[PDB]
Amino acid sequence: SKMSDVKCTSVVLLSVLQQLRVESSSKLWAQCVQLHNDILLAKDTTEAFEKMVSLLSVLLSM
Amino acid sequence: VYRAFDIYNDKVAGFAKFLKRLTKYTMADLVYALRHFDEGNCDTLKEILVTYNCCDDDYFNKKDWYDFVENPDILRVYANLGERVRQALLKTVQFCDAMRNAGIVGVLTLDNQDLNGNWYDFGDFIQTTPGSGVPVVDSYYSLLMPILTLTRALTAESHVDTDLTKPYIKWDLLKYDFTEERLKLFDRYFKYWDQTYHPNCVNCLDDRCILHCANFNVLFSTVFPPTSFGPLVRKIFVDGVPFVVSTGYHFRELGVVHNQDVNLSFKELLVYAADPAMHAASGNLLLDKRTTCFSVAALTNNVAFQTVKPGNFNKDFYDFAVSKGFFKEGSSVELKHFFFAQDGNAAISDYDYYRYNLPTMCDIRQLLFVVEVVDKYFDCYDGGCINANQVIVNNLDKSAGFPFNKWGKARLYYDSMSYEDQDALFAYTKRNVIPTITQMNLKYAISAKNRARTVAGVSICSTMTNRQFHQKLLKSIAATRGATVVIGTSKFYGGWHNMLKTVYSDVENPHLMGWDYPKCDRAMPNMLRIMASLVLARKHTTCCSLSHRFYRLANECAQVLSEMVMCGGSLYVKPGGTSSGDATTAYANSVFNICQAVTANVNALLSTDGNKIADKYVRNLQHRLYECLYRNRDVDTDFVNEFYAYLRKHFSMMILSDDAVVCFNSTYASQGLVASIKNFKSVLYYQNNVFMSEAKCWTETDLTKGPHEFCSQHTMLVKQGDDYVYLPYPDPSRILGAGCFVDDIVKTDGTLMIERFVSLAIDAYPLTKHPNQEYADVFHLYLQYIRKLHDELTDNTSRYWEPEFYEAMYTPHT
Amino acid sequence: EDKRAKVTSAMQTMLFTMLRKLDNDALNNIINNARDGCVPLNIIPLTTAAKLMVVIPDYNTYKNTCDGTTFTYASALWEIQQVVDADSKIVQLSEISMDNSPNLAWPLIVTALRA
RNA sequence: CCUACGCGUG
RNA sequence: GCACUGCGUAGG
Ligand SMILES: [Zn+2]
Ligand SMILES: [Zn+2]
């Protein structure tokens, strides 16, 4: 299903961001953690995709 | 209409709602409303809160207003009553004085005191010689005890000349001994409490006296400045060098305690290092606005922020599950358990939750009777002190606490000191109080909630001494089968079925019930923790003297109840509660659970009409319960035994830490003879200071189905060898989340870890018998993935993917 | 036994280092003022700490507590010396403002000295 | 019986 | 990077 794979992609994306020393910046890390937590608790697929896209854009920025 | 009355006569006794200028409501109505809380039926509480300008009607439109956790502002609303309550107390004393001057002997009840403080009852009054009148205030003060702290009546005492309008009284910072103030407060408020009150618990005759003095001290401590409480330190000259060393402790409940072996070796090095005095003296002043708790000092030049990393993903297992048809659209089984990352402010924020722990004063008579009843539940166990050579530690690779964590683990400290040094340290703790520092860390677990979880690691000395003190009893409790406490009883090899059969032992109309304690660790009152510690220390009748046991209790309070807690390199004062790193964390929680259950039963029985009860035995039992509660000081062993037998017959209990499962008689609960969910709700409301929601509680009408949930496991009746047997199965989501998500990256590689999935299959095997097919497909998927992992790694290993090995683990053979 | 000696040396060094970090000018005053010589631990940093560290979660708390270069706390006057952010970057006083608050890595750690 | 690895209540 | 409780795994 799309829910499980989008949650797994969000988890791996946050892992990559953590390995990218994103935790050095407090606000960026807070935003990433909030987006990830919302994705995992998201019950609607569209919102999960929106937050996953936001996290992917954060990753692409650096 | 119906009004709350506390009645005593040969026919009936109890505090209950009876069908039957002066204000419309009396004090008894207020106490009944605040001690018997029903969310649906708050009419009396709402009207009392509106007529006396506490909150407007609009306040009740907001939902969850009664809940403290959701709406802490309610604490303010109740506080608006406190002053009035205080006035009533003063008036009561005046009334009592008059009676002594009138030579009048009688009993005083809340029923006869309007909420304005006036007393309008002269009945049950027998004239005697003038100046010899002796009022009975046990029931009155006992029942009114909780409201005083809940309404914060004595707040006015914190002002100069006891007026809220005028500014606060400014006590000298150096001052710490408030014994005279405590005596003055007792003489002004509880002048007619005949039992002797000791401001310092070190002069207490027995554990019951200690409980009484601590109950009064909890109320009296709120007035005094917070900074006064805490470790007491002095400067001494050692080897021609100044050292700031602790020489006492101020407890909000035990008063001032002074070390007996104060003077001015490796053991003394531990005593000095564990003492927060040196660190606090050498630490810079700190002010933290992120939390409402008191801040001590800062031991680091910069604040430290810790974060929780994201969970690692096992691509192989998820792909394997997907290929096998799992995790499709609309499937019942889904991922609901994950590793939840947290920001740098999480730890401190969770510590702020300790704000939910409020000063709580308990009905002393009720608490005494409840602890007497609870002591019966722990009679079979054997406890006492043991030497260092008899101490067993499961794991030594753990942390030793601060500053002990900087230099090594527990192996270092246990090897450094010989058994003689440990015995000397234990003896010193039996004579002096050693404050310690406990470090809070964030635990990396697979939870289904976004909230963070913290673990408290206490100092090495605290763990060592608490072990030497309590390990015999702890192991005795863990080594029994068939008792109320089911710690140490495994769920495998038919243990689940044996336990469930034990609960069902002889119940006329068996019905099952369960509950959980909201914010159990944070909201646990200090008085109940002290009671649990005393209950666990009662086993030291022959080994330890009164002074030794009192000093052990003081050490426990200073190392668990109210200690210095390090978060991010900053020291704070813990308001109260129970620490997560205590040696007796689980057993103290079990004692607290049993105490709450007994209190709920007592309240349920007394709240009954009595006249309506058609059973002579139960009516007489209620009458004698009131006798032993609010009329007899000495413990009645015979009635305690009778009440314990009654509870066991009509209230079988499984208790583990805070989780509980009760089998009770439906008819008795319906008639109010035994506690129900509403009784537990009320108990937690007026004692635990937390609102209990019915959504999280479950009640089962059919014993065949079994408990809805216990230890996060569900019960199911299957067929094994022509015998119907209860087995426990977990939520498939939890097992699947454990399989897919691992904390470390090595566990992601399936080849290295083939035992994780073996254990998860040993846990998920019972799902194979579930009517739902996907639940059994979970176990089959685990078996197939185990086989695939073995193939990738490549006779013995066959048993891992053959189901007989997992089936055998649930057979009563072993 | 060798590790035991190492640990003994470690605690002794730590205690003596804390003593060096400790000062007696105010401690002796407090002890002599005390009739019994025993004083609560908590008040010792309050009345003897040379440096004060304040953790501010938001701008409103900053304004309510310490807004200017000097402020009053614990019945003592403290002068601002440093204002670092969550990233340990030297945030200047001028930067702290309601308009620029969203651009600051809260909470802010303020280090001040007793006046 | 003893070590190490892995897997429920706070 | 806590307290215990229980269950597998491999060597003396
Ligand atoms: Zn006493
Ligand atoms: Zn003993």
Side-chain angles (χ1 to χ4, degrees), chain A residues 23-27, chain C residues 86-87 102-104:
Chain A
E23 65 183 1
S24 180
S25 161
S26 290
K27 276 170 28 166
Chain C
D87 276 358
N103 296 115
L104 294 174

Side-chain angles (χ1 to χ4, degrees), chain B residues 54 162 207 268 697 729 766 768:
Chain B
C54 306
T162 61
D207 303 359
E268 64 182 1
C697 297
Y729 73 84
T768 189

Side-chain angles (χ1 to χ4, degrees), chain B residues 580 657-658 711-712 734 747 756:
Chain B
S580 179
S657 298
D658 43 8
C711 277
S712 279
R734 204 261 171 271
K747 286 146 72 151
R756 288 196 71 252

